[PDB]
RNA sequence: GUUGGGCACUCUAAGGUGACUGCCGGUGACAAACCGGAGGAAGGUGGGGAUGACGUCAAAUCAUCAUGCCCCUUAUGACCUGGGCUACACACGUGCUACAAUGGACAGAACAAAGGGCAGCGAAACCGCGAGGUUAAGCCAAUCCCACAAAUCUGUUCUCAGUUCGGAUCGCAGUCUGCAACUCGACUGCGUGAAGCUGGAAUCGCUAGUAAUCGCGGAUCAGCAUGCCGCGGUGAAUACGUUCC
């Protein structure tokens, strides 16, 4: 069950509290930031891929 | 204070260099002797006053 | 006229503060001058690994800084001058 | 009007030096009226103590940030800073003293997977 | 458990975003609309090598640039590729498109089509090490002071699959100015999936 | 590695003494200088109440009485677990004395530590009292094991 | 359910009042765990869907200011 | 003594009075503002007239065996409806709803 | 600091300068280097971060993804409601709160940093003991809001008890979020107040703005924090040494 929960989650619901964030590109809910609207580790990816154009390493 | 202080001092330090004497007797030759003759001196100086 | 521009990198928008400083100043508009704003920054921390280990992970760091530059007297040789100014996409002018 | 900047621990001071008697106002207020424990008041008079600086200067501060031995510190290093504005004499005295130095030690940051930027949380075997 | 990725490691000291711009108040929408502007990008022309697309976003208007070491392939007869690749993408993203074309000389340094012919020669059977070799002879002649191209995966081998390291020159990773060229590419071959990895220190900057 | 040194502040506004914001820095708890000064000074001003004195000189005195001169340290050759005695650095004379005091003060139990460290200060004086239980037991330790050195 | 009002499902309150309107019956089939109970089903045998069956449960006098999945426990132990 | 209970006389009236079972702190500061002892008192130490005003403000509030009596009454309404509520009052397992694999060690 | 005024000062954010054993003396092959000294805001990689070599454990991830091979297919796929992932006799890791006068309660005075805010941050006023409620200013934010920091300091009060310690648990009545708080939310009010009076064998963290302690913030998220990630506040004790693990 993959292709069918992202189309659920594509769906409008019956509630708009049965709504909650998912992936956007790599299919999973836990640690879907609200800013990118990305999944954690294709943040990671694309972060590394030079893309996303906030974030780089890092130090303070 | 003063004096039990420098009892308990002297007696240790006669210790090591009777000990130190007492483990090696022939090296490091002599400066023992000379270590073990003035303690052993300054710990009558001190339990004489 | 209060312009201030936000970007991601420094040189870029030094670039953008400075164009527009440099044609408003030519033409008498008595530019104050590109008046540094503190930046605001967001921290992402991310657990490395893909399964296990919340004790490895990673920081990633978002800053935005932004400068205010304001023109007071009106000359609007330097509006139709900062009507034709094309700056890139980094800065995101909004007067 | 002698001015030096004193710096410690996110903590800035701001000491005008004025020609008077010894009367610190911090804020508007005096010394035991925003400061207490006064081991602070005698360690924040210091560079006026060590150098015969007794009472021919009054000090007036504008401190902020940080807490209250945090301004202590920033306050006597402003102090210590604009007593040398007054003589560039005794710098001798106040560098043998310590005085300018500005102690760095900010509170260090938080280590991912650490409690507390030293802290391992607990080991188990 | 092993090394951060060098293009990762060098943004915003060195090596620029390719996505450039700043956030206006959607800004994941314009993130989500270039993932599928690359993802299209990569499927049509991963056939034609273009290694990498700079996307810029200015109020209405996006100019796309495309790095892709020859020209006549991706601007062709002129009107057919800029038309056939502006359309669907005005229309599947929503907006404006311009679309600027820069040709990289040197097409040997950049680690993206340099991991890809690596790839494709693996999907055409040459064996890796020709491949790698024959590779690092053409970054080497095409001018570059190392090159470090790792291969892993079932090499015809089945029930064991293993790292391949081949390298010349020096590729400092530690150095923070040493602009490096990092790329992966994938080979799906009839024992399952190939891994390249290559990256290439080009020269610093002082 | 090599031996590294410390540094501590000179005054305290009553009493000004380096051994005594010594103190101050001991028995702190929880980062709070505030609580140990005023139990500090509360306890010495009950010390320069209830015996006419100045309570330096009471102190230094009760100092005086806990300072040990010997330690016995350890010194384990194959399964003997030997003790040798050490002539105590004043440095850590001078601690060992303060940590005695803090210590068997809040240990010895009165309503609140400026009495109990007050109370404690006046039996070291007097030289019989709680830390000077473990100067006793330290010297007979090493009166007893003075065969090594 | 504080001041917007209680709360019970539309669907089973229309069948409690097509009960009530008549007279009782057989058990009420409610999936409806979450739903208080009015003092008007007071009497009638309902069936909550715990999971996995439907109980049977009979309303007195008492049993008003809880709700429904009060009166079936959804994890048998021992 | 007043609600069939002691209180002890060497304590503050304010504390005294938490003794009886239904008046804890602030049920006696809101006695003692209606009486007006200025809560500075012992209880060794009042008047007739000033205790006797305590103890009938005490008689018309809910404390002593009326509480014991309806707190029994409610025990024994969720035992006897059913109520997996009273399940856990009854088989020694929490009641507001709290994890059982680990403490829950005031019940057994 | 409201106005006019000023860029001095702090601050902010850009470009610099700046610390390199550079200079002195000593030791040491003359080296490399080391010990003390001078200057200096900074002294010997100044404090910290990011950076994690070849490889080890066929360590972990087919459940982020992509996947070779094998299996199911009107089902090992799909929808829907309901339950469960919160069970509970037990063990076991990490944590929070205490066992109390350096304390508890009450009142007064002050001091932060860092970060967040558009169908969001939400002032102020009013009501409610309180959780909060109604109307709403300003704010796409160095302005406005979150945001009244807390330990601290100073007074009042208790006086060493299972208590004016501690809050488990529990009854009743409430508040907010949201179709909906029964299993299974947080918070408040009243009442009840337990075990616990510093912990056996064993065992862990930390070398300085650290440990200890005190609050603050943000993700996640309608709502759920004792977790995590950062932030400041006060702020130590010790390092003789390498005998032992």
Redesign the pocket.
Known sequence: ??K??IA?QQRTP????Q???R?ER????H?????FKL?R??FRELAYKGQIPGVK???? | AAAAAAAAAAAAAAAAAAAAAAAAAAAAAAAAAAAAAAAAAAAAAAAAA | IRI?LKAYD??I??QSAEKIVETAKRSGASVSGPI????????Y?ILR????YKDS???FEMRT??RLIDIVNPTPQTVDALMRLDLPSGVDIEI | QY?G?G?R????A?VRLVPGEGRIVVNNREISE?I??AALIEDIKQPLTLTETAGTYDVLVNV????????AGAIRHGIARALLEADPEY??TL?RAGL?????????????????????????? | ????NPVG?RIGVIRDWESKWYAG?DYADFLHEDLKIREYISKRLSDASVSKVEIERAANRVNITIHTAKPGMVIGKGGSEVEALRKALNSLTGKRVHINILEIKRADLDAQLVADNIARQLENRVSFRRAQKQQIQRTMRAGAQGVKTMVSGRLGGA??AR?E?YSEGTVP??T?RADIDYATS?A?T????LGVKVWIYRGEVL | ????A?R?VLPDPIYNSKLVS?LI????????????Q??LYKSFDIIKERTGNDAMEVFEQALKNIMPVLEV????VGGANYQVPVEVRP??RT?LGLRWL?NYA?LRGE????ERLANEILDAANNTGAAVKKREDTHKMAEANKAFA | ????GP?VDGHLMTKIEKLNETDKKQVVKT????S?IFPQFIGHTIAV????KHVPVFISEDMV???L??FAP??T?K | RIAGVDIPR???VV?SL???????????QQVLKEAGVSE?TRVRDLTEEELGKIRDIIDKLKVEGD?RR??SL??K??IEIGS??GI??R????????????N?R???
């Open positions: 069950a993959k069918s929960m659920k019956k509630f708009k509290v709504e909650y964030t992936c790599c299919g999973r809910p640690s879907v930031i609200r800013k999944c580790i294709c390493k890092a130090s303070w | 201030r420094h040189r928008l030094d540094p704003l503190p930046t605001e920054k967001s921290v921390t690994a893909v399964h296990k992970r990673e920081q800084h932004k | 001015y900047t710096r621990k996110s903590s800035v701001r925003h207490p424990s902020h940030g940080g807490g209250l031995s945090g301004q710098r001798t560098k300018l130095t500005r102690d760095a030690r900010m509170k260090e940051r938080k280590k991912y997977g650490l409690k507390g930027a030293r802290r391992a949380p607990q080991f188990s075997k | 458990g092993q090394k951060v490691l108040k029930d064991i790292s390291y990773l530690h923070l994938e799906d009839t024992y399952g999936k | 590695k090599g031996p590294v410390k501590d010594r820095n001991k028995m702190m708890i929880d980062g709070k200088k505030g609580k140990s005023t139990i340290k350890a010194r384990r440095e850590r601690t803090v809040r309503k609140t530590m400026e | 359910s504080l001041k917007k709360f999936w409806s765990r979450r208080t869907y715990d999971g996995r200011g809880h709700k999945g009060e959804t994890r132990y | 060497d304590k503050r504390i938490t003794y009886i079972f239904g008046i804890g702190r602030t049920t006696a500075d509480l309806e707190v409610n025990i309404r969720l997996y509520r856990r009052h088989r020694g397992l929490p009641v507001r709803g709290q994890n059982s694999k680990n829950a005031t019940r057994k």
